[PDB]
Amino acid sequence: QGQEDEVVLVEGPTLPETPRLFPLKIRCRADLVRLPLRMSEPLQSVVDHMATHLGVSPSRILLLFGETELSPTATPRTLKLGVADIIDCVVLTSS
C-alpha cells in the first residue's frame, strides 16, 4: 500500500496536485530566507531568487554549506539540503 509516482509521459493533463516541495533554508548577508523548492530542483531556483533579492546577477551567486562549494546545477537531493540545512548565498566577482 503506497503507489507513489506520477506518469509525466503520454499526454500532459491538468495535475492540481503539485510535487512535494519544502522551504529551502538560504542564508542572506545577515538573515534567513525560505522558498518552496523540490529536492530534484537544481539550486538555480535559490540562485535566481537570491539574485533578485540582492539586486545582482544569478551568475554572481555561490551557495556555500559551511565550507563546501555548491553550484546552481547541483540539487539539494545529492547535497542533502533541507529546512534546517542552511546554505550561504555569497555574491562573488564571477569573471
Largest CA distance in the chain: 53
Cell numbers for 7, please give them.
506518469
Beta strands at 61-65 and 87-91: parallel, antiparallel or unpaired: antiparallel
Domains in the chain, ordered, with CATH? Answer: 1-95 (3.10.20.90)
Dihedral, CA of residue 23, residue 78, residue 61 and residue 93, to nearest 10: 160
Helix residue ranges, H only, the chain: 44-54, 76-79
Q: How many residues does the chain have?
A: 95
Question: Cβ contacts of residue 35 below 8 Å, gap of 6+?
Answer: 23, 24, 26, 45, 46, 49
What technique was this entry resolved by?
NMR
Residue whose C-alpha is closest to residue 60's, from 93, 24, 18: 93
Residue showing cell 539550486: 43
Residue whose C-alpha is closest to residue 62's, from 23, 83, 91, 39: 91
